[PDB]
Design a protein around this ligand. Structure first.
Ligand code: A1B1C
Ligand code: ZN
Length: 140
C-alpha cells in the first residue's frame, strides 16, 4: 500500500483505490495502473521533473529503502494477476530490487522529488508507474 500526497491530490495504484478515492475522482488510467483523487488537506510530496534513471524506493516487505537503477518509462507486458488480465502496461520502469504484491504504492524518488510508485514485480524485479509526465499534479 502507499500513496503520493502532492497539493490537494492523492496518487494511488488504481487496483488499490478505495471507495472514497472513486467518489472523489480526478483522473484514472487502467493502462498505467494509476488513479488520482482529491484531498481536503495539502500534501508535502513534490514531483520530480527530470530525466533521472537512478533513485531510491521504499520496500514495505523489508521495511527498507533501496537504491536502484531503472529503465526509462515504456510499454511492458505484465502477466495476468488477480487485478488485471495479461496486458501491456504503459509508462512502466523496471529495476532489479526485492518486491512482493503488497509493496505496491511504495515511493520511488530522486534528488528532484517523487518519480513514481511501485506497481509490479517478481523474481528480483520491481516495476514503477512513472508520474513525472503528469504536469497538472503541480497546479490547482
Ligand atoms: C509488486 O508486485 C509484485 C511483486 C512480486 C511478485 C508479484 C507482484 C504482483 O503480483 C503478480 C504484480 O506484479 N502485480 C499484481 C498487482 C497488479 C500489478 C499491475 N500493475 O498489473 C501486477
Ligand atoms: Zn531526478
Amino acid at each position: 500500500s502507499g500513496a503520493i500526497y502532492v497539493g490537494n491530490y492523492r496518487v494511488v495504484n488504481r487496483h488499490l483505490a478505495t471507495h472514497n478515492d472513486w467518489a472523489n475522482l480526478v483522473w484514472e488510467d487502467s493502462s498505467r495502473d494509476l488513479l488520482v483523487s482529491s484531498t481536503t488537506a495539502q500534501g508535502c510530496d513534490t514531483i520530480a521533473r527530470c530525466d533521472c534513471q537512478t533513485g531510491v524506493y521504499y520496500c514495505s516487505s523489508r521495511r527498507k529503502h533501496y537504491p536502484v537503477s531503472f529503465s526509462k518509462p515504456s510499454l511492458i507486458f505484465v502477466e495476468a494477476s488477480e487485478y488485471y488480465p495479461a496486458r501491456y502496461q504503459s509508462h512502466l520502469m523496471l529495476a532489479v530490487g526485492h518486491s512482493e504484491p503488497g509493496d505496491c504504492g511504495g515511493i520511488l524518488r530522486c534528488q528532484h522529488g517523487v518519480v513514481g510508485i511501485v506497481s509490479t514485480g517478481g523474481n528480483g524485479l520491481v516495476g514503477f508507474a512513472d508520474v513525472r509526465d503528469l504536469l497538472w499534479l503541480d497546479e490547482e
